[PDB]
Design a binder for this molecule. Structure first.
Ligand SMILES: CN1CCN(CCCN2c3ccccc3Sc3ccc(C(F)(F)F)cc32)CC1
Ligand SMILES: CN1CCN(CCCN2c3ccccc3Sc3ccc(C(F)(F)F)cc32)CC1
Ligand SMILES: O=C([O-])C(=O)[O-]
Ligand SMILES: [Ca+2]
Ligand SMILES: [Ca+2]
Ligand SMILES: [Cl-]
Length: 66
């Protein structure tokens, strides 16, 4: 799905292949959804299968399609 690859690029602000909690928080704020660190940390932990504290593309697709 190409829409999913685009949405990943949107969230991965610095393009380094990982969505950090700070990127996620800033994007949600751009969308008008103001979230706390505790909140975006929890969303990340739910998707973070390899436990590195970030969401890579492999993790992102699993989350978006399961
Ligand atoms: C794709 N994305 C994933 C999950 N869902 C909704 C989750 C949050 N959501 C929400 C929560 C409670 C009641 C209504 C809505 S709709 C909505 C609209 C915009 C956003 C905004 F602006 F924050 F993105 C978030 C949401 C649909 C949107
Ligand atoms: C179940 N189905 C797929 C999953 N969810 C989205 C859950 C969290 N999600 C979210 C929630 C509210 C509004 C937008 C988004 S998009 C998004 C982007 C990255 C992550 C990150 F970085 F944490 F993975 C999690 C999310 C919506 C519907
Ligand atoms: O931002 C908040 O406080 C929330 O979503 O509960
Ligand atoms: Ca990044
Ligand atoms: Ca990870
Ligand atoms: Cl804070």
């Amino acid at each position: 799905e190409e829409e999913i690859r685009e949405a990943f690029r949107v969230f991965d602000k610095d393009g380094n292949g990982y969505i950090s909690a700070a990127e996620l928080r800033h994007v949600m704020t751009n969308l008008g959804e103001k979230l706390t660190d505790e909140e975006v940390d929890e969303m990340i932990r739910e998707a973070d299968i390899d436990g590195d504290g970030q969401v890579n593309y492999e993790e992102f697709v699993q989350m978006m399609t399961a």
